[PDB]
Amino acid sequence: ERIRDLTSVQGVRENSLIGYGLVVGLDGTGDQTTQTPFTTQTLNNMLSQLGITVPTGTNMQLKNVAAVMVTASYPPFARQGQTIDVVVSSMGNAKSLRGGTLLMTPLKGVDSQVYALAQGNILVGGVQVNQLNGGRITNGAIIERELPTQFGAGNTINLQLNDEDFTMAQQITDAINRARGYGSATALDARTVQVRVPSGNSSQVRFLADIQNMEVNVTPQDAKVVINSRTGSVVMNREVTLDSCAVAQGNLSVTVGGSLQSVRSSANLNSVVRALNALGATPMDLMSILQSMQSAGCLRAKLEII
Amino acid sequence: ERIRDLTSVQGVRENSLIGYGLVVGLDGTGDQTTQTPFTTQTLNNMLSQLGITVPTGTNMQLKNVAAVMVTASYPPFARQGQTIDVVVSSMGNAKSLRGGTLLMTPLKGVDSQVYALAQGNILVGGVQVNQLNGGRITNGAIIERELPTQFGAGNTINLQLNDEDFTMAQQITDAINRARGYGSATALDARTVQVRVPSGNSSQVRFLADIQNMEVNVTPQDAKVVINSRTGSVVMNREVTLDSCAVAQGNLSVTVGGSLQSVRSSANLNSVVRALNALGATPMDLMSILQSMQSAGCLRAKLEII
Amino acid sequence: ERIRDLTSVQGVRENSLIGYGLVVGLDGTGDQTTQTPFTTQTLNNMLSQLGITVPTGTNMQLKNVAAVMVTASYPPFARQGQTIDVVVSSMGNAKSLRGGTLLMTPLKGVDSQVYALAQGNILVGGVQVNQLNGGRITNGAIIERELPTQFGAGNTINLQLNDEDFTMAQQITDAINRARGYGSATALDARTVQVRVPSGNSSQVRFLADIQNMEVNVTPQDAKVVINSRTGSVVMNREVTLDSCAVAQGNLSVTVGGSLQSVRSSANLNSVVRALNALGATPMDLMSILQSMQSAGCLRAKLEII
Amino acid sequence: ERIRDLTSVQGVRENSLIGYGLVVGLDGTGDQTTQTPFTTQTLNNMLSQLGITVPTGTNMQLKNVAAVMVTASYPPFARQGQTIDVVVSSMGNAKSLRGGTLLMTPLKGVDSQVYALAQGNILVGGVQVNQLNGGRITNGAIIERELPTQFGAGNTINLQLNDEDFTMAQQITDAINRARGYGSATALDARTVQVRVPSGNSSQVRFLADIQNMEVNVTPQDAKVVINSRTGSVVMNREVTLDSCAVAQGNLSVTVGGSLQSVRSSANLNSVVRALNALGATPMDLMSILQSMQSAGCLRAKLEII
C-alpha cells in the first residue's frame, strides 16, 4: 500500500464551509412561503441589494423560489481562483430542486468569515427514488480568501496515520528510514510519525512527493467484526478466529438432529465462514448469534455495533 | 495530460454576475401578479423610465410578464465589446418561459457595480420533462466594464492545480524544469507551482501558451470510492484495493451455501469488481456493504458520501 | 492469538463525543415543527449566525429539516487534521433521514469542550426493513483539539487484558519474558501486566509494536453458558461439562417410553451437544432445562442471562 | 473439574452499575411524552448542557426518543481504558428500541459515584417473538474510575467455593496440599479455603494462575430434585434414590389392572427413571407425585421448588 493511502500530512487539512441562499426556477415545487417567511424576507433583501424595494405589506405567495443551505469543502492550500463543488439542500417546504439555480451565496467557515461565493445550476437525479430536495453543483463556488498555513516552516512534518496502530507506525518509520538515511523518520505514537524535512517549500514538497507514493507492507490489523443492525449488514475481518462452541437459536435446527448446532474451532477466515454457514442462519439471526458467542468468548475478535 | 487540463493560472479567474429583470411574451403562463406585486412594480418602474406613468391604483392583472433572476459569468480578461451567455430563472408564479424575451437587465457583481447588460430571447427545451421555468440565452449579455487585472506584472506566475497533490505538483515542476532551463519552476505546495516569467505581457503570454499544451504523466492519484446515495451511484477509483473479508447482507445468499459470502483479497480493480460482483448485490445494497467493510478495514480506499 | 487481540494499552483509550445539529433536505419526512419547537429555534439561531434574523412571530411549519443528535468517537492519539465517522440519529418527529445533510455540528466530550466539527451527507439503507431515522457519515467530522496524553512518560506500560484471567495474565507475562530479557514484564493482577519500557516515544512505540503482533497460547478460559432469552439464543463454551441427570419438561417425551428423559455424563462438548440433542427440545425449552439443571448442579458450568 | 470452575477468589468480585439515559432514532416507536414528561425534561437538560435552552412552555410531542435505564457490570480489576457491555431497557411507553443510539449515560454504583460512561448503538433481535424494548451494547461503556482493591496484600487468599460442601472444600485443600508443600492450604469452612500466598502482586498472580487450572475430583454432591412448576420442568440429580412405594394419581392406571401403580426400590438413577416412567405421567403430574412421595419418604432426596 502507498503511504498516501493510509496517512495524511499535518499541514494538509480540510475545512468546512456553510452558507444560506435561494434557488430559483424549479417548475413550481418551491417553498410554501406562507409557512416559510424567511424565503420571502431574504428574497426581498436580495432585491433591495439589487435596487428593488418591495413594500412591507405584500402577499409574497411565490412558488418558484426555495430557501436552501449550501455546504462546501475548503480544499487544502486553496487559491483565490479555484472553484470547488457544493451541496445544496432544501430548508423549508420545497417539493423539489430539479432545475434550480443558486444565487451568489457567501460561504462561511467556523470563524464566520466569507471564504467562497457559490452560484450555479443544481443537478439532481432523474422502488428506489432519487432525493430531489438535495443536489450538487460541480465547481459551483469560487474561493475568495486564503487560509494562512504553516506548511514549509520548521523541519519536522507529522505524517498522521488513519486507523491508529503501533505496528503500522513502526512499519512506516522503518520504510522511510530504509529509503532515506538514518534519523529521517521517528515514530511518536500509534498515529503520528515525525519526519525530518529540510527547510524550504520546494524541498519539503519534493520530499513529501517522494514519500507519498512509496509502498509499505501492511501488517495484520486486528480481528474485528462489524454489525450494523440498521442496514442488516455483517462484515468480518481477515484475522477473525472462531473457537469451538455450541449455539442454539430460535427456529434453527441441524440439517441432517435438532437444535443446538455445533461450531468447530477454526483459525482461518474461510473455515470461519464455512462453520458459520453450516449453522444455517440469516444475517439478522447471525448478529444475535455472534453477540451471544462473544458474550461467552468463543469468537476471537471484537465486535462493534456500527 | 496537458497542463491546462489540471491547472489554472493565478491571474485567470472567473467572476459571477447577478441581476433582476422581466421576461415578456410567454403565451400567458406568466406571474400571477396578485401574489407577486414586485413584477408589476418593476414593470411600472421600467415604463416610467421609458415615459409612461401608470396611476398608483391599478388592477395590474397581467399574465404575459414574469419576474426573473439572471445569472451570468464574467470571463477572464473580458473586454467591453464581448458578449456572454446568461441563465434566466423564474422568480414568482410563472408557469413557463417558453418564448419570452429579456429586457435590458443590468448584471451586478459582488461589489454591486453594473458589469454587463443582458437582453435576448430565452431558449427552453421542448416521463422526463424539461425544466420550462429555466432557460439560457447565448451571447445574451454585453459587457460594459473591465476588471483591473494584475496579469503581466512581477515575474512569478502561480500555476494552481486542481485536485491537490504533492506528487502532481512535483511532476509539473519537473516537467517545466526539463522543458526550460534550471530554476524556471518551483513547487510551493501541493496545489501551487511558481514559474519565473519574464516581464512584459507578450512574453508572459508566450510562455503560458507554450506551457499550457505541454504533456505531463499523471501519477496514480489516490484510492477513493464515491457513494452518492441520492442518485444511487457508486464509483470506484483505479487504485481501489480490496482486502479479504466476509460480508453478510439481508436477503443475499451464495449462488451455489447460505448467507455470509466471502470476498477475496484483490490488488487489481478488475479483480475488485469481480469479487464484488460474485457478491450479488444492487448498488443500494452495495453502498451499505462498502461502508460496513470500510468500518472494518477490508477496503484499501477512503469512501466519500457525495 | 496475537497480544493485540486480547489486550489494550494503558495510554491508548477512546473518548466519546456528542453533539446536536440539523439535517436538511430529506424529501419532506422531516420534523413536525409544531410539536418540536427546538428545531425551528436552532434553525433561527443558525440563520442569525449567518446573517438572517427571522421575526419572533412566525409560523415555521417547515418539513425539510430534522433536529438530530450526533455521536462520534474520538480516536486515541488523534490529530487536528484527522477525520472520524459519526452517527446521526433523529430526535423529534422525523419520518426519515434518507438523503439529508448535516450542518457543522460542534461535537463535545465529557468536559464540555468542542473537540470536532461534524458536517456531511447521511447514508441510510434502502419483512426486515432498514432503520431510516439513523444513519452514519464516514469521515463526517474533522477534529479541532488534541487530548494531552501521558504516553511516552515514565518506564512502565500497563497492558490491560480483556476478559480478566490470572492464567492469561501469567501467560502474557511469561511470553514477554521469553521474548525479551529477564524482568521485562510482571503481572500485577488478573487484568494488568506491567512491562518495563525504555524512555522515549520512539523506543516505546517500537517495543509496543514488537509486542503487539506476538503470538501467545490461550489457556482454556472457563466453562460458561450464555442464555439471552430476549433474542432466543443459547451459546455453550468449549469447557462446558455435563453431569448425569434426569430431566422432565412439558410436552417432551422419549422418542422410542414417556417423559423424564435421561442425560448421560459427558466430559466433551460434542458429547454434551449429543446428550442435549437426544433430549429433543427447542431453544426456548432448552433455556428452562439448562436453568433447572444448574439449580440442581448437573451442569459443570456457570450460566449467565445476557 | 478445574478449580476455577467451582471456586472464586476473595479479591476478585464483580460490581453492579446503573444509569439513566436517552435513546434516539427508533423510527417512531418512542415514548408518548404526554404520559412520560421525564423524557422531555431530560432531553431539555441535555440540550441545555449542549447550549440550547428550550422555552418552558412547549408541546414536546416527540416520538423518536425513549427514556431508558442502562445496567452495566464493573469487571474485577477494571482499568480506565477498558470497555464493558451494557444492557439498555425501556422505561416509559416506548414500543421498540430497534435501531436507537444511547447518549453518554454516566453509570453509577452503590456508592453513587460515576464509574463509567455508556454510549453506543442498540442491538435487538429481528409464535416466539423477540423482546424489542430490551437490547445490549457490546463494549458500549468506557470506564472512568478504578476500585481500590486489596489484592496482593497480606499472605492469605480465600478461595470461595460455589455450592458449599465440606467434602468439596476438603478435596480442594488436599489437592492444593499435594501440589504444593505442607501447610499451603487450610479449609476454614464448607465454602472457604485459606491458601498461604507469598507477598507481592507477581507471585500471588503466579500462584493463583497455577492453582486455577488444576484438576480436582468432584465427590457426589447430594441427592436433590428440582421442581420449577412455573416453566413445567423437573430435574433429578445423579444421587437421587427411590424407595419402594405405591402411588395413585388421577386418570392414571396400570398399562397391562387399575389405579395405584407400584414403584420399585431403585438405587440407580437409570432404575429410578425406569420406575418413574413405568408410572406413565406427564411432568405436571410428576411434580405432584414426587411431592406426595417425599411427604411419605419413599424418595431418598430433597426436592426444592425453584
UniProtKB/Swiss-Prot annotation, chains A, B, C, D:
Predominant cellular place of this UniProt entry's protein:
periplasm
Establish whether keyword Signal is in the entry.
Answer: yes
Which GO annotations describe the biological process of this protein?
bacterial-type flagellum-dependent cell motility
Pfam families per UniProt = FlgI (PF02119)
What NCBIfam families does the annotation carry? PRK05303.1
State the family named in the UniProt similarity comment for this chain.
Answer: Belongs to the FlgI family.
Function according to Swiss-Prot or TrEMBL = Assembles around the rod to form the L-ring and probably protects the motor/basal body from shearing forces during rotation.
Q: What is this protein called?
A: Flagellar P-ring protein
Organism expressing this protein natively = Salmonella typhimurium (strain LT2 / SGSC1412 / ATCC 700720)
Q: What is the lineage of its organism?
A: Bacteria, Pseudomonadati, Pseudomonadota, Gammaproteobacteria, Enterobacterales
